[PDB]
Amino acid sequence: ADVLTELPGVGPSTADKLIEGGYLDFMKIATATIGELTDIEGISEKAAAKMIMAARDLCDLGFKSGVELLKQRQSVWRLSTGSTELDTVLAGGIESQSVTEFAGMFGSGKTQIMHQTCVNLQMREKIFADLEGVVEEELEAPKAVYIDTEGTFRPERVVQMAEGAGIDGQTVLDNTFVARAYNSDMQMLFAEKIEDLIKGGNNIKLVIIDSLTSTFRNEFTGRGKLAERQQKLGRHMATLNKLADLYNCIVLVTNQVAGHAATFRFFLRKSKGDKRVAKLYDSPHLPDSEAVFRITEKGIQD
């Protein structure tokens, strides 16, 4: 919560050094390590360790039980994919505070789904949030971040899907940030820079990395230095998982295939005609199931 001066032991000066260093929220200080904190101007370990321990207090990061376990879960909001069967398989839609992956072969529809989610994010009938754990002012003016890795982002497809949904295409475009990444370094940097958008008043609620693995697969072709690949990709994933937890946003990624973390995993396959099949083969509380949907001029439906 923006007002760092409330942090016992933290004055206006210290606080200044903080907001600069990237800490503007209590949670980010509470979940920080003495290292990443002392790496700032004049912040000693005693001062670093103390505020850190104090931020945890403010946020009440302790042991929870009984009904309190159900409260933490109500903070997770979901987004509709546009498909009824798909949302039912996700028990609502795509979850915030998690990374969900859509893997599949060429033309299976991974990119189409990413575009649709930017459109649905701008319609509150598409957003399913529990009011007991998500105050609507937190969902106000939601913005998306689309890190394009192959250059497949299509402004016209979003406008078309927006028409199909019954809203203004230009509106979706105004509330969507697109960053073209030409390599793994750029992909990773863009993801670390999302914190800057939020510091700039932008309520980033949807982060898309399309695709998550093509650059890594391009820069580490030799299956000898396959360990350096997993290490770099491993850091990228922790950054993504952390920003989904900290800013209560959903993280969406695509993967082309013919291993890395992610809480929900789907296999997408072409079927007859405009039909498609999405199979959930991995999640912590949902069973493996399949969903049939279509891709059309309107976008994703059924």
Ligand SMILES: Nc1ncnc2c1ncn2[C@@H]1O[C@H](COP(=O)(O)OP(=O)(O)NP(=O)(O)O)[C@@H](O)[C@H]1O
């Ligand atoms: N405007 C549109 N109207 C109807 N169908 C469309 C439209 N745009 C794209 N499609 C369909 O979407 C399919 C391709 O979707 P796409 O999301 O790009 O696949 P993909 O998973 O991203 N594969 P890849 O690009 O190799 O990573 C096409 O082959 C079209 O049939």
Ligand SMILES: [Mg+2]
């Ligand atoms: Mg999470």
Ligand SMILES: [Mg+2]
């Ligand atoms: Mg694609």
